[PDB]
């Protein structure tokens, strides 16, 4: 089977650079070109460029040329891309896909899982969990604010997961060079403040686990 395993995600400072991998398998490496696409949350894929493993003939998309260099290792049948002096608008997901022939004009028939590049300069930083409680009818929504952490990810749970349904954990946003997210849970009025409702926030990178209890009043 045609397989393309791309390198893991990379976290690197702006101004620097980075070379990511794409390793082909299940087919003759040099008989098919490799292309690279760029995807930012802001929809759309951008066609970076295309390199022919057999000859090493690259062809770039003006808009990426100069800062981008496509190379390959016709030995470990692995294809590489290098991005220099990184900017934030470098932050994104990069795919490498095999290109193919029918009727004069290529197409990409096999892609990788993509690599996620994040260009920042913050450092492993734990978040501050803030309980969200109503101030001083049948169903009650509580929350928990996870602010000022970095880098993603952070895992949130309610009552160690015993409260699954009616939960909502929102995508993070970059506040001041850091991340912040929120999470809600909707439980009946009989449950809280009757019983205990606690958010379990885990932030791996900083080896942090927090259990904040949502208590009545402000």
């Amino acid at each position: 089977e045609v397989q393309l395993q791309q390198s893991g995600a990379e976290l690197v400072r702006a101004g620097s650079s980075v070379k990511m991998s794409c390793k082909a398998s299940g087919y003759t490496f040099t008989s098919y070109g490799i292309n690279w696409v760029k995807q930012r949350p802001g929809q759309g894929l951008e066609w970076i460029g295309y390199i022919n493993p057999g000859n090493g003939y690259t062809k770039y998309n003006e808009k990426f040329k100069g800062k981008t260099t496509l190379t390959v290792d016709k030995s470990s049948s692995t294809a590489y891309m290098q991005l220099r002096s990184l900017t934030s608008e470098d932050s994104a997901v990069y795919f490498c896909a095999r290109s193919v022939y029918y009727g004069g004009s290529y197409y990409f028939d096999y892609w990788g899982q993509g690599t996620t590049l994040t260009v920042s300069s913050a450092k492993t930083t734990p978040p501050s969990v803030y309980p969200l409680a109503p101030g001083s009818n049948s169903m009650v929504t509580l929350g928990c604010l996870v602010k000022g952490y970095f880098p993603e990810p952070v895992t949130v749970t309610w009552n160690s997961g015993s409260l699954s349904s009616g939960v909502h954990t929102f995508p993070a946003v970059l506040q001041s060079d850091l991340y912040t997210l929120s999470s809600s849970v909707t439980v009946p009025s009989s449950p809280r403040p009757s019983e205990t409702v606690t958010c379990n926030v885990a932030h791996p990178a900083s080896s942090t686990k927090v259990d904040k209890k949502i208590v009545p009043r402000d």
């Binding site: 066609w47 501050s128 101030g135 604010l145 809600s184």
Partner: protein, 214 residues
Amino acid sequence: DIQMTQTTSSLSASLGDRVTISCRASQDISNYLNWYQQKPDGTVKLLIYYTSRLHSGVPSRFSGSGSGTDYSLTISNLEQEDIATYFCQQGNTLPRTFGGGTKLEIKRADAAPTVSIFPPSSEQLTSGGASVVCFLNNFYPKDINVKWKIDGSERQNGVLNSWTDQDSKDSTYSMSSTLTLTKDEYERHNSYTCEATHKTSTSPIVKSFNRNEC
């Protein structure tokens, strides 16, 4: 270069519906148009190629056509697995270009958001900061607007919003708005309001609180 346009970012359908996603080149592509599917998990797969029509190993319900500038993909019978984002791609001129994509979603009965507002926590106030959060959960369609009013007026700065993809059990959407001030600014005012405007009704759903009342 050649600009690829996909009118409709989001497209609604029920399971079992004939679905059609359009795509239009800025010129004559001479029938060199492809189609890729991308699941939420991020992966990308080829579906059709060469002005649509030509398959890969994909199910029969997928069909394609087009010519010159106007092209399209059609899924004769929408299947749950089909729910994703579809991009078209012209392979006629360099650089190779992509359409904006269209993301299917399921047809739910309009809902009206459940709005909750939450003053800042003592814990955070002690930090000197103050953040007022507001949830607008389980609503459909996905279009919504959240307006923050401090002491009955304006307020744009300090507002940060987050949205969730469509839910997989019910087909609703949800939204989290967060207004962050400094402890001091937060104490210089009294009523904080979170207004939600949703087609679900012409009168915004308003939720707020008074500090003096806490």
